[PDB]
Paper text:
β-lactamases inactivate β-lactam antibiotics by hydrolyzing and “opening” their signature β-lactam ring. In serine-based β-lactamases of Class A, C and D, this hydrolytic process is executed in the deacylation step involving an activated water molecule carrying out nucleophilic attack on the enzyme-substrate acyl adduct ES*. Here we report structural and computational studies of Class A β-lactamase PenP with Glu166Tyr mutation that analyze the interactions between this critical water molecule, termed WAT_Nu, and other components of the active site during a full cycle of hydrolysis. In summary, by analyzing the reaction intermediates observed in the active site of a Class A β-lactamase hydrolyzing a β-lactam substrate, our study has uncovered critical features within the active site that coordinate and activate the water molecule for hydrolysis.
In the active site of the apo structure, the mutated residue Tyr166 adopts the same conformation as the Glu166 residue in the wild-type structure but the bulky side chain of Tyr166 extends much closer toward the catalytic residue Ser70 and forms a stable hydrogen bond with it (distance ~2.8 Å). The Glu166Tyr mutation has little impact on the overall structure of the active site as nearby residues like Ser70, Lys73 and Asn170 adopt essentially identical conformation as in wild-type structure. Notably, the key catalytic water molecule, termed WAT_Nu for its potential role as the hydrolytic nucleophile, forms totally six hydrogen bonds with partners including the side chains of Ser70, Tyr166 and Asn170 as well as the mainchain carbonyl of Ala237, the main chain amide of Ser70 plus a possible sulfate ion from the bulk solvent. Compared to a similar water molecule observed in the wild-type TEM-1 structure, WAT_Nu in Glu166Tyr mutant structure is located closer to Ser70 and Asn170, but farther away from Lys73. This difference is probably due to the bulkier side of Tyr166 as compared to Glu166, resulting in WAT_Nu being “pushed” away from Lys73 and toward Ser70 instead. In the apo structure with ES* absent, WAT_Nu is coordinated by a network of hydrogen bonds involving Glu166Tyr, Asn170 and Ala237.
Residue numbers in the entry: 31 to 57, 59 to 83, 86 to 238, 240 to 252, 254 to 295
Write the structure that this text describes.
């Protein structure tokens, strides 16, 4: 009942799914409960981008304007005059959670409806992309627009990063971006022992939604793929990163990973 205890300590709802790809062992807590996916969708969106382009095609320069900027544009706001390549957009999106970068990438693959179709093609019938930033963060309880589940996000992230939805050189680009994410140090990363490599993508949205999805490599062994999702009752709720860090610690102990 440690996940329940965390829900109690943090006045939140948790959604957990974790798969040890070494043993096929699984840790689940509300694994099929929907949450707003928030910026975790950025990781899947780059998976789809990568599928649709050669590596060299990522060097395509995307010109854009001030009207492409939205609520959080840490990288894209600096390069309006020069544009940015698709590769640079992917970097910004994954490593800084640049919202305008996600929108520009979405545009290049044909929009939310197109993303949805490519996700269905790789076998995800759950994740429901419908809107761009900033609106995709606004999901009320019981709505399904721009939501997914912990099980579906783990399944989809594994498929792109570790299985055969991408060729090895494209898996490597995705993995390396997510390993070097700047936004996640207080989340899954904080619940895994020092030195263990972590690839992650965070998210935050309305109703105090606070998410992280990750691949976690022990020093030797097959990786664990994990989604820790959370949300709260009030629309303007605050979140606490420590919830996600502590949930991760529970998952790691439940998988017999602390230590090795």
């Amino acid at each position: 009942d440690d996940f329940a205890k965390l829900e109690e300590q943090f006045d939140a709802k948790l959604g957990i799914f974790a798969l040890d790809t070494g043993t096929n062992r699984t840790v689940a807590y509300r694994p099929d409960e929907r949450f707003a996916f928030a910026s975790t969708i950025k990781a899947l969106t780059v998976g789809v981008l990568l599928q649709q382009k050669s590596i060299e095609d990522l060097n395509q320069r995307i010109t854009y304007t001030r009207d492409d900027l939205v609520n959080y544009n840490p990288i894209t706001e600096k390069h309006v005059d020069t544009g940015m390549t698709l590769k640079e957009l992917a970097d910004a999106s994954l490593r800084y959670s640049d919202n305008a970068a996600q929108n520009l990438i979405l545009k290049q693959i044909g929009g939310p409806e197109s993303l949805k179709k490519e996700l269905r093609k790789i076998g995800d019938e759950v994740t429901n992309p419908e809107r761009f930033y900033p609106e995709l963060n606004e999901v009320n309880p019981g709505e399904t627009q721009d939501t997914s589940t912990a099980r579906a996000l783990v399944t989809s992230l594994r498929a792109f990063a570790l299985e055969d939805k991408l060729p090895s050189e494209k898996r490597e680009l995705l993995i390396d971006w997510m390993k070097r994410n700047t936004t996640g140090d207080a989340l899954i990363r904080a619940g895994v022992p020092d030195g263990w490599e972590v690839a992650d993508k965070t998210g935050a949205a309305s109703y105090g939604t606070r998410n992280d999805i990750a691949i976690i490599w022990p020093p030797k062994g097959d990786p664990v793929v994990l989604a820790v999702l959370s949300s709260r009752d009030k629309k303007d709720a605050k979140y606490d990163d420590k919830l996600i860090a502590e949930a991760t610690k529970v998952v790691m102990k439940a998988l017999n990973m602390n230590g090795k």
